[PDB]
């Protein structure tokens, strides 16, 4: 059925944008040394049911915190993130240090996700409990959007540590700890029953579980 | 309608990179004009524009959508060119990037076809003169595409204003692209149903006021 060497099968992983970002790097080692007419396609989150999208093959394995998804689903854990907070280097609180009410009163970016059940939901409520309303400028449905925008302008942005830190290497932001007790995040990847045994789904979930994600 | 003191949520339906590049540019508008305002950023979906500006689902759609046409009117606000890039640290990059040794190279391509994104002509283009193996990842969003290319060895054919942003901030260099690739115009697009419509308004004067560099 499948053949790492010969195969052309085009893979499809759905993820957040950052999940893809995160993922499909650490895919191309093994798929030059040994899979280099394979194709890995990162597919964003939608708001249909994704078990159905994992059911009918239209999505091989999804990758982040999806909480909704149980039945028929069979899963396997790969790493915890935790939340950070980010402003740019240039913003008038980072001369200055912030506690929980100063935080308040700062301008937001929120990062939405309720729609596609994704686990940041989690997050984004307990934001939009903590926020005054009038503190949220933008909303996005994209982490990476997100990031750029916070180095652009003076926003406060509350994201996982990984992404964080991807962009405090170039300097524009600084990270800060979230000034509340945010959950601890389990990232997943996901694939249905119906292709347990798939020889192709099972190779790939080989090598993502073999990713060093440290 | 007063910016002053309104508290509307507008929604822009845009490209990640859309997003990314509009936001940025009305911060201060409503920092020192309408401070409560809050701007959405929505990501173009699998259905038809035109049925979520009329909806009001919308309030304008900013890129090029050529597609859009019933119903709905345009303000041309800039125009567009192609670029590739690849990190500093690639082999190619030595090397010059004509079109036989841009087909041994592998690639990244942002598809944009669901969503009647006028990016489906580049995407287009491109597979037609590559080699089918030397296609490597597939993604819908031009940022995570990005930072893919900044990772790893793949050839990334974008926006030049999305590469001159990431050839600033790093490793990516940019080459032109030894294929024939349409211009692009980007414009704002909403329904004639809100042409009138205060809020509305008030948004596309704003943007049309934006200086793109």
């Given at each position: 059925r499948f053949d790492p060497?010969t195969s052309?099968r ?188 798939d020889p192709g789904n099972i190779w790939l ?10």
């Amino acid at each position: 059925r499948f053949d790492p060497g010969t195969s052309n099968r085009n893979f499809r992983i759905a993820a957040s944008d950052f999940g893809q970002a995160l993922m499909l790097p650490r895919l191309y080692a093994t798929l030059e040394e040994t899979a280099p007419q394979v194709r890995v396609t990162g597919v964003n989150l939608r708001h249909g049911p994704l078990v159905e999208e994992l059911e009918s093959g239209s999505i091989d394995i999804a990758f982040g915190g999806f909480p909704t998804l149980s039945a028929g689903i069979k899963t396997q854990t790969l790493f915890r993130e935790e939340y950070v907070c980010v402003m740019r280097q240039s913003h008038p609180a980072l001369t200055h240090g912030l506690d929980l009410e100063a935080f308040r009163q700062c301008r937001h970016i929120i990062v939405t996700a309720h729609e596609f059940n994704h686990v940041h939901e989690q997050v984004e409520a307990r934001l939009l409990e903590l926020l005054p309303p009038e503190s949220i400028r933008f909303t996005t449905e994209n982490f990476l959007v997100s990031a750029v925008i916070a180095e652009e302008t003076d926003v406060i942005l509350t994201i996982p540590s990984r992404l964080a830190r991807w962009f405090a290497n170039r300097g524009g932001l600084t990270i800060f700890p979230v000034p509340i007790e945010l959950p601890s995040i389990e990232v997943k990847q996901y694939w249905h029953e119906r292709y347990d045994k798939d020889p192709g789904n099972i190779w790939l979930r080989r090598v993502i579980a073999k990713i060093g994600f440290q």
